Design a protein around this ligand. Structure first.
Ligand SMILES: Nc1ncnc2c1ncn2[C@@H]1O[C@@H]2COP(=O)(O)O[C@H]2[C@H]1O
Ligand SMILES: Nc1ncnc2c1ncn2[C@@H]1O[C@@H]2COP(=O)(O)O[C@H]2[C@H]1O
Lengths: 49, 197, 78, 101, 541, 180, 197
C-alpha cells in the first residue's frame, strides 16, 4: 500500500490537467514528448530533432 | 365548565366556617380549587404566635406547592373563613390533567405572577415602612377590593375590625389609635366603619 | 506616523506650567534614557509624592480636553 | 501593462490610467493633501486616498500636469526604445501610444 | 456552435465524455436538467420494494484553470432517447457538438486608427447580450491553526468608538437593510488569542476606557479583499457577545436547516404509518376526523397486524431516536469552541465567481491564427450599417490577410453568411408560424441542398410535432461541415449565398452613421466563427 | 429597465449556496422581463423565495400599480433543500439613454450596498426607420413628405412619442432662440 | 438539553458588571434567560435606600411577569453582580415556544413555587423570628445552598456582614456587635470571612 501510494502520488511527468477545453484535454491526452528520464533536453537537442 | 364534569365524580366538599382545610405537616396528597368561599392561609410558630400568609378566595387553588415535587409537607395552615365548597384533585391525576390541557396553566401562572408582585411589596413594607404607612396602604387597598360601598365622595369599608387584623397581620389597638391619627389628618372617617376619601 | 505623533506631543506639552510638563516628560521618560518614578518626583522636586498624582491628573484633563484630544484621536485606532 | 493605439494623440502625449498615476505619485499627492491640510496626518491622507476623494483626482491631474515619465519596451536595442512623453490621464486600462513611434 | 464545421465536432464532444442508462417501465415521476425520477409500474413494482426508480444529476464546479464546469440538457422528457445520445451538454458542447465560441457579424475595414495593427473594433450591442461576457471562478481560504495562547476562535469583538466610520452611518449600518454588506466586509470572523505588548500610558488608558477583558483575542476575520466584484458563492469548512450571537445564530441557521430536513423526510413516512392501519379493514371515516395518532386503536385483527402495529411503533422509535442522535452531535458541534487537531485547529474554504462586462484589452481571435487585441467598444449608432439600418457587430483590419495568408477565414466567413441566410428563413417561418406542410417542404428542401451530399434524411419519417420539436430546437443555428482538405469550392458558397438572396461575393454597400452617408466602395460582409481566450487584460494587467 | 438589489441568506455579492444561476444570467433573465407602469414613471419591486423549484416572476411582491404581463418569465432556480433566496429588482424609469456603462460614466454618485447595475434594453422603443418622399403640392412637387416607421413594445402611443419629441426640441432650442 | 433548545431560539448578549439590564417603568416585550453570571433584583424607595428582594443565578428566567399579559410594565430593577451572558427572546416567540414544547414552563413553575416559599419564610422571620433568628434562618439556608469551600474542620462564608444584613434588614456596626455576641456565645467567628461554626 505504501508503495502504490507513493508512486501514484509522486512523479515527474504528471501534473494538473488543461481543463479549459475538451480539445485541449484530448490533445493533452493525444500528446507526445521526447523528454523526461532517458530523454533529451532543450539545450542538448538541436534542429534535426 | 370543568367544574361541573369535575363535580359529577364528587370531590367537591362543602366545609363549614373555620373548619381547617390544611394542617401543615400533612403529607401532600391532593390539590384543591375553591369553588365557593373564602379561606385563611396561615402559619404558627411553636410558642403559639400565629401569622396569616394570605386569604384565599373563590377561583383559586390551595396547595399547589406540592404538585411539582414528591413527598412534601404542606407549607401553611389553610382554614375556612366561611362556608367553603371546595374542589379536590389528586396530584397524580392533576398531572394527567396538565398533560391533557395546559391552557389552565396560563391563567394559573398569571395569578402566581400577581402573587409574587404583592409578596415582594410586603417584604418592602415590612423592612422599610412603619405602622402608619402599612395601614394607609391597607385602608387604601381596602378602598378597592370588590365589597366596598360608596359613601358619596370617598370610599367606604365596614369589616368591623377583625378581618383586617388577619389581612395585614397586626394588633387592633394600634389599628384603632392610628385610625384616629388619620382622622385628625382628615384622611379616614372611622367609628368602626372607616370611610377612605 | 511616530514622528508626527511625538512632534504633536511636544507641541501639546510645550504649553503647560513648567512643573506639569516637566514632571510628565521626565516621569514617563520622555526625551532621555531614564525611568523616572514619583518616588523621584519626591526625592528631586519635593518629598511630596501624592500631589504629583493630583498634578498628573490635572494635566491629563488639561490635555485630553477634546480641543487637544483629536491629534491623539487618529491614534485611538492604533 | 498592455498597450493600444492613441490615434488622436499629439506627439508629446501618452496615456496614463489614473490608477497607476496615483500609485506612483502618492508621495506628491500626500505632501499636497498636507499642504492644503484636508488630510491633516498621513493616517488621514492614506485613508482619504483609499477612499478616493474627488480632490485626489483633480490634484492627481495638478501634480501630473507638466510631470514627465518614461516608457520602456523590451528589448531596449538602441536609445530610442526608451523615451519620455507628457502624461495624458485616462480611465482606459490600455496605454495609448502615438502611432508613429 | 460553429456554423462551419469539418465533421469532427461531434465525436470529440462525445468522447470527452460518457453516457447513461434507464430503468423499469413506468411513468416519469420528477423531471429536471440532470435528474429524472420514475415510478415503476404496479405490476412491475415488486410488492416488497416501493420501486421509485430514481436517477442522478449534475451541478456547477470550478476548473483547474479557474473556469466554470456544469452540464445541462439538450433534450426533452417524454421523447425516445436512442442509445449513445447526449442527454446533457457540457462547458463547450450543445446537442453533442463542440462549442468554443460565438457566431456574429463581421466587416473588414480600417477605421480611424482603431484597427491600426491587429486590433479589433466592436459594437456595444454584443455585451448587452453578454454573449462574450463570462465568468472566472476563483478561490480563497482560511487555515485555522493551533496557537500557543489558545485556539483561534470564531468570534469578533471591537472597541474604539464605533471602531470608527461606523460612527457616521445612518441608523441602518453597513449590515444595512436586509443584511446588506459592502466590499471589504467580513465573511468568517476568526479571532486568535493575543500576547501582551509594551504598556505605554496612551494605549493602556485606551484599554482602561474600553477594557477588553483579558488575553485580548486578536482579530483574524476572513474578509472581502479590496474591490471584489466576484461572488463568495459558498463556504465549506474542513474539520464575546457577537461570539454567542453568531454561534447560537449559526445554530438558528443550522437547526432550521435540519429541522426542515427532518420535517420533509418524515412527513414522507407519515403517509405509510397512517395507511398501514387502513390495510386490514377500513376506518373509512373513522380514521381521519379523530386525531390522527389515535388510529392504532382503530381496526385490529389477529396474527399479522400486531406485528405491523409494532413495526409502526419501531418506526416511531428509530426515527425520534436518530433525531436525538443528530441533535446531540450537531448541537455540541456548534456549541464547541475551536479545539480540533494538531495544527488543524480547523480549515475554512471559499471560492469566488467574477462575471462582468467585457472591455478593452481582451484578446479575441478566430480559427486561422487571426488574433486580435481590443481597443474600444463602439456604440451601435456608431457602427457601420446598411440601408436596412442594421449595424455591424465588429470591424476588422484586412491590413494583414495577404501577409497572413489565412484565406480559410475568408471561406469560413462566406459559408457563415449563407448559413444565417437559412436561419433567417426559419425565423420568418416561425414568427409567421407556417403550416406543417410548408415547414416540411422548406426543411427537407434545406437538408437536401448540397451538390452530392454524402449524408441524407427524409422528414416524412417524422410526424408533425417531431418536426415542430425539430424546428423549435434548430433556431440557435444549424451547422455545416467543410471538411478540411475535402472542403468547399467557390462555386458552392456562391450558389449557396445567392440562395440566401445575398450578393454572390457578399459585398454590400455600407453606411456610416456619423453622417449617415455611404462609404465609397462596398465591403466584404459575412459571419466568422471566433474564439475568446484566457489571455485577458484581466489576466495580464 | 433599471436595476436589481440582492440581499439574502449569506453575504450579498450575490449568488449563495444553492443557486444554479450565477448573477448576470438571473439579471439577463430580468432584461426580457416586461413591466408596464401606468400612473407613475417610477417603480421598485421586491422578491423572496425559498426551497426547491423554479424561481419565477409570480412570486414577486408586485406593486398594485404594476402590470406583470408574464408571471412565467423565469428568474432563477433553487436546488438545495437548505437553499433559500431573497432579492430586490429595480424595474424601470431610467433616465436619458442606454446602458449602465454610460450611466456611471455620467454618475459620480456611489450608492450604498446591494446594488447591482444593469444594462437597459428596454420596452416601447425597439427599432426605427424613415423615408423622405416628394410632397405633391400641385406646383411644389419637390416638397417633402416624411414617413417614420417606428417599432416598439406596447405601452407607448407613438404620437405621444412624437409630441414629446417636438416639445422637447422646442424646449432645448429655447436655449438658442430665447438664449442667444 | 431543552435548555439548549430554549437558548437555540435566543439571542445571547454579554453584559459586564453593574449593567442595569432591566429597569422599572419600561414596557415588557422580552423574556430573559441567564446563560451565564449572577444578578441582583432591586426596588427603590420614594425617598431613601433600596431593597434586593432576592438574588438570581444561572438557570433563571427574568421578565416573565410581563409575559402573561399585554402592555405590562417592568416591575423592578435588576443589576448584574458579575459579567453575564443573557439568553433573550421576545414574548411572541415565547408563546410560539409554549405551544411547540413543554417542560421549560414546568421548571419555571417549580422555581416560582420555591421563590414564593422562601420569601414567605423571610416574612415569617421578619414577623416572628428576631434578627439573630433571621441570621439563623439565613445562615442555615446558605449552608444548604452552596458556593463555599467546605473548610475541612468547620464552615465558612465570604461574608462582610453586609449580605446577611441586606437579606435580613439591619445596619453594620450593630450586627458587628451581635455576631461578636455570637462569638462570645461560641456561635460564629469572623475576620472579613465569617466562619459559621
Ligand atoms: N404568600 C402566599 N400568597 C398566596 N397564597 C399562599 C401564600 N403562601 C401560601 N399560600 C397558599 O396557602 C397554601 C398553604 O399550603 P400549601 O403550601 O400546600 O399551598 C399554599 C398556597 O396555596
Ligand atoms: N422576593 C423575591 N424572590 C425571588 N425572586 C424575586 C423576588 N422578587 C422579585 N423576584 C424576581 O425578580 C424579577 C425582577 O423582574 P420581573 O418583574 O421580570 O420578575 C421578578 C422575579 O423573577
Amino acid at each position: 500500500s505504501a508503495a502504490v501510494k507513493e508512486f501514484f502520488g509522486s512523479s515527474q511527468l504528471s501534473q494538473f490537467m488543461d481543463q479549459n477545453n475538451p480539445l485541449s484535454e484530448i490533445t493533452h491526452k493525444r500528446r507526445i514528448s521526447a523528454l523526461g528520464p532517458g530523454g533529451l533536453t532543450r539545450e542538448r537537442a538541436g534542429f534535426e530533432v | 365548565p370543568t367544574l361541573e364534569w369535575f363535580l359529577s365524580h364528587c370531590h367537591i366538599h362543602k366545609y363549614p366556617s373555620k373548619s381547617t382545610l390544611i394542617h401543615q405537616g400533612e403529607k401532600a396528597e391532593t390539590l384543591y380549587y375553591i369553588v365557593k368561599g373564602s379561606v385563611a392561609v396561615l402559619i404558627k410558630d411553636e410558642e403559639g404566635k400565629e401569622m396569616i400568609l394570605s386569604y384565599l378566595n373563590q377561583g383559586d387553588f390551595i396547595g399547589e406547592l406540592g404538585l411539582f415535587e414528591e413527598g412534601q409537607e404542606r407549607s401553611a395552615w389553610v382554614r375556612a373563613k366561611t362556608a367553603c365548597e371546595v374542589a379536590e384533585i389528586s396530584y397524580k391525576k392533576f398531572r394527567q390533567l396538565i398533560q391533557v390541557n395546559p391552557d389552565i396553566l396560563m391563567r394559573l401562572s398569571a395569578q402566581m405572577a400577581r402573587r409574587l408582585q404583592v409578596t415582594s411589596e410586603k417584604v418592602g413594607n415590612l423592612a422599610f415602612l412603619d405602622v402608619t404607612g402599612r395601614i394607609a396602604q391597607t385602608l387604601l387597598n381596602l378602598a378597592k377590593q370588590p365589597d366596598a360601598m360608596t359613601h358619596p365622595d370617598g370610599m367606604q369599608i365596614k369589616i368591623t375590625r377583625q378581618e383586617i387584623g388577619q389581612i395585614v397581620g397586626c394588633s387592633r389597638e394600634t389599628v384603632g389609635r392610628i385610625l384616629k391619627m388619620l382622622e385628625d389628618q382628615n384622611l379616614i372617617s372611622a367609628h368602626g366603619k372607616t370611610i377612605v376619601v | 506616523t511616530t514622528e508626527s505623533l511625538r512632534a504633536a506631543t511636544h507641541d501639546v506639552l510645550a504649553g503647560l506650567t513648567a512643573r506639569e510638563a516637566k514632571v510628565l516628560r521626565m516621569r514617563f521618560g520622555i526625551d532621555m534614557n531614564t525611568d523616572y518614578t514619583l518616588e523621584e518626583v519626591g526625592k528631586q522636586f519635593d518629598v511630596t509624592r501624592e500631589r504629583i498624582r493630583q498634578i498628573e491628573a490635572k494635566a491629563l484633563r488639561k490635555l485630553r480636553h477634546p480641543s487637544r484630544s483629536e491629534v491623539l484621536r487618529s491614534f485611538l485606532d492604533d | 501593462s498592455v498597450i493600444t493605439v492613441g490615434p488622436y494623440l499629439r506627439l508629446h502625449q501618452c496615456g496614463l490610467p489614473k490608477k497607476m498615476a496615483l500609485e506612483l505619485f502618492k508621495p506628491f499627492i500626500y505632501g499636497k493633501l498636507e499642504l492644503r491640510g484636508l488630510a491633516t496626518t498621513i493616517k488621514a491622507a492614506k485613508k482619504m486616498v483609499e477612499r478616493e476623494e474627488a480632490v485626489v483626482w483633480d490634484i492627481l491631474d495638478e501634480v501630473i500636469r507638466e510631470h514627465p515619465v518614461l516608457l520602456n519596451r523590451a528589448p531596449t536595442l538602441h536609445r530610442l526604445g526608451i523615451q519620455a512623453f507628457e502624461p495624458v490621464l485616462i480611465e482606459g486600462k490600455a496605454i495609448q501610444l502615438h502611432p508613429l513611434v | 456552435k460553429p456554423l462551419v464545421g469539418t465533421g469532427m465536432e461531434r465525436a470529440v464532444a462525445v468522447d470527452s465524455g460518457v453516457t447513461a442508462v434507464a430503468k423499469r417501465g413506468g411513468v416519469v415521476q420528477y423531471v429536471d436538467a440532470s435528474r429524472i425520477v420514475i415510478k415503476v409500474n404496479e405490476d412491475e413494482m415488486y410488492p416488497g420494494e416501493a420501486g421509485i426508480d430514481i436517477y442522478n444529476l449534475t451541478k456547477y464546479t470550478r476548473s483547474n484553470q479557474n473556469t466554470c464546469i456544469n452540464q445541462m440538457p439538450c433534450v426533452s422528457l417524454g421523447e425516445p432517447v436512442e442509445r449513445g445520445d447526449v442527454l446533457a451538454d457540457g462547458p463547450s458542447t450543445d446537442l453533442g457538438e463542440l462549442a468554443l465560441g460565438q457566431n456574429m457579424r463581421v466587416a473588414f475595414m480600417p477605421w480611424n486608427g482603431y484597427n491600426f495593427e491587429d486590433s479589433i473594433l466592436v459594437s456595444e450591442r454584443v455585451v448587452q447580450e453578454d454573449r462574450f461576457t463570462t465568468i472566472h471562478i476563483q478561490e480563497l481560504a482560511c487555515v485555522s491553526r493551533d496557537t500557543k495562547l489558545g485556539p483561534e476562535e470564531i468570534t469578533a469583538d471591537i472597541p474604539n468608538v464605533g471602531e470608527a466610520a461606523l460612527s457616521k452611518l445612518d441608523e441602518s449600518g453597513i449590515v444595512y437593510i436586509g443584511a446588506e454588506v459592502t466590499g471589504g466586509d467580513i465573511l468568517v470572523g476568526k479571532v486568535t488569542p493575543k500576547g501582551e505588548t509594551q504598556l505605554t500610558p496612551e494605549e493602556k488608558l485606551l484599554r482602561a476606557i474600553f477594557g477588553e477583558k483579558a488575553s485580548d483575542v486578536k482579530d483574524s476575520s476572513l474578509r472581502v479583499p479590496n474591490g471584489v466584484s466576484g461572488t463568495v458563492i459558498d463556504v465549506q469548512v474542513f474539520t464575546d457577545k457577537r461570539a454567542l450571537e453568531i454561534e447560537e445564530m449559526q445554530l438558528k441557521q443550522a437547526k432550521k436547516d435540519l429541522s426542515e430536513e427532518l420535517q420533509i423526510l418524515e412527513a414522507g413516512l407519515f403517509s405509510r404509518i397512517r395507511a398501514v392501519l387502513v390495510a386490514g379493514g377500513v376506518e373509512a371515516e373513522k380514521l381521519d376526523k379523530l386525531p390522527r395518532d389515535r388510529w392504532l386503536e382503530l381496526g385490529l385483527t389477529d396474527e399479522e397486524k400486531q406485528n405491523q402495529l409494532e413495526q409502526l411503533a419501531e418506526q416511531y422509535d428509530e426515527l425520534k431516536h436518530e433525531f436525538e442522535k443528530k441533535l446531540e452531535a450537531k448541537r455540541r458541534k456548534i456549541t464547541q469552541g475551536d479545539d480540533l487537531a494538531p495544527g488543524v485547529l480547523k480549515i475554512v474554504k471559499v471560492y469566488l465567481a467574477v462575471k462582468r462586462r467585457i472591455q478593452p484589452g481582451d484578446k479575441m481571435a478566430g480559427r486561422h491564427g487571426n488574433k486580435g487585441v481590443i481597443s474600444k467598444i463602439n456604440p451601435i449608432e456608431d457602427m457601420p450599417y446598411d440601408e436596412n439600418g442594421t449595424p455591424v457587430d465588429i470591424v476588422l483590419n484586412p491590413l494583414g490577410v495577404p501577409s497572413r495568408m489565412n484565406i480559410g477565414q475568408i471561406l469560413e466567413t462566406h459559408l457563415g453568411m449563407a448559413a444565417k441566410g437559412i436561419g433567417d428563413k426559419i425565423n420568418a417561418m416561425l414568427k409567421q408560424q407556417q403550416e406543417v406542410a410548408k415547414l416540411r417542404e422548406f426543411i427537407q428542401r434545406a437538408y437536401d441542398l448540397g451538390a452530392d451530399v454524402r449524408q441524407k434524411v427524409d422528414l416524412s419519417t417524422f410526424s408533425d410535432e417531431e418536426v415542430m420539436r425539430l424546428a423549435e430546437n434548430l433556431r440557435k443555428g444549424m451547422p455545416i461541415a467543410t471538411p478540411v482538405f475535402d472542403g468547399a469550392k467557390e462555386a458552392e458558397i456562391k450558389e449557396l449565398l445567392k440562395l440566401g438572396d445575398l450578393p454572390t461575393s457578399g459585398q454590400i454597400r455600407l453606411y456610416d452613421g456619423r453622417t449617415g452617408e455611404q462609404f465609397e466602395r462596398p465591403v466584404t460582409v459575412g459571419y466568422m466563427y471566433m474564439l475568446k481566450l484566457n489571455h485577458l487584460v484581466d489576466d495580464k494587467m | 429597465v433599471t436595476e436589481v438589489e440582492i440581499d439574502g441568506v449569506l453575504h450579498e455579492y450575490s449568488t449563495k449556496e444553492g443557486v444554479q444561476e450565477d448573477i448576470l444570467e438571473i439579471l439577463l433573465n430580468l432584461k426580457g422581463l416586461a413591466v408596464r407602469v401606468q400612473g407613475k414613471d417610477e417603480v421598485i419591486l421586491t422578491l423572496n423565495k425559498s426551497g426547491i423549484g423554479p424561481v419565477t416572476a409570480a412570486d414577486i411582491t408586485h406593486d398594485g400599480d404594476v402590470e406583470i404581463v408574464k408571471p412565467q418569465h423565469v428568474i432563477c432556480h433553487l436546488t438545495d433543500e437548505n437553499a433559500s433566496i431573497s432579492m430586490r429588482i429595480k424595474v424601470q424609469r431610467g433616465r436619458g439613454y442606454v446602458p449602465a456603462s454610460t450611466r456611471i460614466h455620467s454618475e459620480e454618485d456611489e450608492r450604498p450596498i446591494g446594488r447591482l447595475l444593469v444594462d437597459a434594453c428596454y420596452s416601447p422603443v425597439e427599432r426605427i426607420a424613415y423615408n423622405v418622399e416628394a410632397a405633391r403640392v400641385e406646383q411644389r412637387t419637390d416638397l417633402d413628405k416624411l414617413v417614420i416607421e417606428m417599432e416598439t413594445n406596447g405601452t407607448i402611443d407613438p404620437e405621444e412619442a412624437i409630441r414629446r419629441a417636438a416639445t422637447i426640441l422646442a424646449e432645448q432650442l429655447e436655449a438658442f432662440v430665447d438664449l442667444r
